[PDB]
């Protein structure tokens, strides 16, 4: 199991748990706008 | 070199000198050592083509 | 089979393990927005197979952290197969019993059966042995041998243990053996380095020019050529098991062991 | 042979293959060679093996054994550790198949801790077994040919592995005449054969393992017979030649015409229409 | 609906397990999917195992072969003219 | 780099050699082809290649 592989996608999959917020903000907001 | 051989300025020619009909001919001269022919040379760098 | 040779059980396996329990955990926050347990085992499950049934998480921006975190895993077993196929493609056969200084040649009867010392007599090798270990040429009397090819069928046929004789003829042997049955003790090791040389009466006048005859030799690099065309050996130039998860199966007893004693735990509460 | 009738004068000319050597240049008169072909050597091409179903083959059935086994002790472990055992093993039996069926409902938290963590071993196991198939595929085509003169294996002989040349032939008096090979002529010497015909039939039939001769010869019996391949460099590099005594008075006119015929295209035409014809 | 179920699961069985319904129904049909799935597991492993052996597998390129081609034969038309390269006063130049 | 590279494994389109030209009647030619073929029966000309 090399460093790299458990890098170069799981610093992905963390900025993807940190980046569900920002789209869970993005689509409350435009079920309320309309 | 085959004009040298012939006109007995030299006994012996070594050297890369392919075998004709037409040398042989004029100058007789020993079995052949290498292997050699005609072909064509090509670059092919352009594409891998793999 | 390097069942514990892997890089698991180190920081990168407790990593990615608290990386999942916390992605577990903004997944039932997000769903929120007895779904823990629920979203634990699915996301274990999706990390090992996708045959478990999880009800845990239904959500739109859900199923965007879903896939990614599949994705993720899909990337993680398919570098674990290509390290295991890697570490398939190799294997280690490194040496047997690493030099004299094994405790089995100071311990020739004490430990499992009888180890036998072949040895030829006549020799320096039976000098060298009687001058440095008198103890062990008293025991290796017993199995002096006659000759090399004698030795050679003797190990081939399981009557000898090892044989200790001349490097560089033990070496020929080694490459001209039928299936490279035999190998010398380690990657090749001498005990007491020596040359061979070319015997001349006390004296003589021809060793002082034998003597840079033969350095010429060796270094206009004749001696190579002849070690080449004289020595060279085949043998020597080339280059689901039960018992490979017998342990993966005793950590999952006692995987076993530790859910039943949770259990007696968790119904004392 | 050819050698002896033409010395002798019961013969004039020998129009045949006959390899350019010294011992022979030495009493006869050789021509230009009108074709090059040095020394290969002829071996039976072993089908590939196609298994396609080596399942339980590979390692060992006794895992494939245990398997079962060990499905049935977790089985039994996390009935015991529920205290529908009957749906929880049919879930378990698809889990470890890929079915999916989804009918197991683990009562304690520890029970599904443990069902995850038997998936888990079960991928790894599958992993493994990926593996294992990776390393038979990777590793097909085990056998390897020999590469000439200058392979160990025939530097070397062995009573089990037999390779003869063919008696009365320049290839003989290459082995001979070069005293760095005298095994391998003296392993060659107890196994040649009358006639290149029955060599071959010989080696095709299993009778042989390798054969070392004319590269002109050994490739068109490859390309006839496919079950036979040819390998090694060329070695011993000699063309054929139209032999004939020193004393003839052809000597300056046929070599001239074999270069001629040699250049005008006619030897090409004549190797496209009696060698190189087919393939395989 | 359940000939398009047991279909879909044959065929999901095949690729993916992602495409479950309700077509097994008793012992013989749950054991027989199983059989099924697991067959269809064999042959994906080795088709795997297949296509990663198949990476060892390369080719080379020889535009025409030999003197005797379409290219060589004809200089006029037919494409771009393709040079030809020959040293005189040699053996090659004659012939 | 290897970049260009003759047509297929290379087919000669008249197949011929080198030797060693002599005068015509030369008296080293009988010799000489006898040294060369020796050379070439000895794997000398391997070496040498
Ligand atoms: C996704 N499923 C496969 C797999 C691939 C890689 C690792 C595990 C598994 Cl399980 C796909 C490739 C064939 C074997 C197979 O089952
Ligand atoms: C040499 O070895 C033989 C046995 O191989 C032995 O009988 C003989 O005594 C030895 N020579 C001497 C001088 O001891
Ligand atoms: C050899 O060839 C030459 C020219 O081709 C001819 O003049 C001569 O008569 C020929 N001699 C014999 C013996 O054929
Ligand atoms: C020989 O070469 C010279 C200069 O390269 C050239 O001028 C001449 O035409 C050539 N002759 C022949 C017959 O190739
Ligand atoms: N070897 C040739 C010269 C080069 C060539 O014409 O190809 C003569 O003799």
């Known amino acids: ?34 | 070199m085959i004009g040298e051989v012939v006109y007995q300025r030299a006994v012996m020619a070594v050297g890369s000198l392919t075998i004709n009909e037409e040398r042989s001919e004029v100058v007789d001269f020993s079995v052949p050592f290498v292997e050699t022919g005609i072909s064509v040379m090509v670059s092919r760098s352009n594409g891998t083509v793999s | 089979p390097s069942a514990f040779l892997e890089p698991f059980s180190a920081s990168v396996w407790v990593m990615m393990f608290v990386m999942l329990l916390i992605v577990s955990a903004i997944a039932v926050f997000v769903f929120e927005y007895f779904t823990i347990g629920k979203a634990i085992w699915l996301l274990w499950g999706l990390v090992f197979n996708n045959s478990v049934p999880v009800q845990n998480p239904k959500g739109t921006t859900s199923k965007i952290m879903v896939s990614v975190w599949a994705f993720f895993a899909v990337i993680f077993l398919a570098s674990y197969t290509a390290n295991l196929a890697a570490f398939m493609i190799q294997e280690e056969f490194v040496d047997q019993v690493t030099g004299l200084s094994d405790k089995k040649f100071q311990r020739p009867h004490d430990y499992s059966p009888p180890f036998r010392f072949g040895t030829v007599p006549n020799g320096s090798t039976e000098r060298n042995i009687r001058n440095n270990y008198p103890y062990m040429h008293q025991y290796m009397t017993k199995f002096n041998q006659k000759g090399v090819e004698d030795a050679l069928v003797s190990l081939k046929t399981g009557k000898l243990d090892a044989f200790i004789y001349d490097a560089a003829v033990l070496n020929y042997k080694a490459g001209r053996d039928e299936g490279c049955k035999l190998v010398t003790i380690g990657s090749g090791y001498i005990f007491a380095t020596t040359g061979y040389g070319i015997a001349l009466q006390k004296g003589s006048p021809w060793k002082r020019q034998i003597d840079l005859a033969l350095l010429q030799f060796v270094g206009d690099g004749e001696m190579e050529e002849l070690e080449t065309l004289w020595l060279t050996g085949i043998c020597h130039n080339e280059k689901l098991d039960i018992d490979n998860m017998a342990g993966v199966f005793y950590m999952l007893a006692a995987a076993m062991a530790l859910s039943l004693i949770t259990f007696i735990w968790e119904h004392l509460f | 042979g050819m050698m002896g009738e033409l010395l002798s004068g019961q013969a004039d000319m020998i129009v045949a293959p006959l390899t350019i050597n010294n011992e022979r240049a030495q009493y006869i008169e050789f021509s230009k060679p009108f074709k090059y072909q040095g020394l290969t050597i002829l071996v039976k091409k072993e089908i590939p093996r196609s298994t396609l179903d080596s399942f339980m083959q590979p390692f060992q059935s006794t895992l494939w054994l245990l398997v079962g086994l060990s499905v049935h002790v977790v089985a039994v472990m996390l009935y015991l550790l529920d205290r529908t055992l009957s749906s929880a093993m049919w879930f378990s039996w698809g889990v470890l198949l890929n079915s999916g069926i989804g009918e197991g409902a683990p009562r304690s938290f520890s029970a599904r801790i443990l069902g995850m963590v038997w998936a888990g071993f079960a991928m790894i196991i599958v992993a493994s077994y990926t593996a294992n198939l990776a390393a038979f595929l990777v590793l097909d085509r085990p056998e390897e040919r020999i590469t000439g003169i200058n392979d160990p294996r025939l530097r070397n002989p062995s009573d089990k592995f037999i390779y003869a040349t063919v008696k009365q032939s320049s290839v003989d008096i290459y082995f001979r005449r070069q005293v760095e090979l005298s095994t391998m002529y003296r392993h060659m010497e107890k196994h040649n054969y009358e006639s290149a015909a029955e060599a071959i039939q010989a080696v095709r039939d299993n009778k042989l393992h390798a054969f070392i001769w004319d590269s002109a010869v050994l490739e068109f019996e490859a390309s006839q017979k496919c079950d036979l391949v040819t390998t090694g460099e060329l070695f011993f590099r000699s063309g054929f030649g139209i032999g004939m005594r020193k004393d003839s008075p052809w000597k300056q006119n046929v070599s001239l015409s074999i270069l001629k015929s040699h250049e005008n295209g006619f030897m090409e035409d004549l190797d496209k229409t009696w060698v190189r014809y087919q393939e395989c």
């Open chain 1, 1 to 34: 199991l090399t460093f790299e592989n458990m890098a170069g996608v799981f610093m992905l999959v963390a900025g993807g748990i940190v980046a569900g917020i920002f789209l869970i903000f993005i689509e409350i907001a435009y079920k309320r706008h309309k």
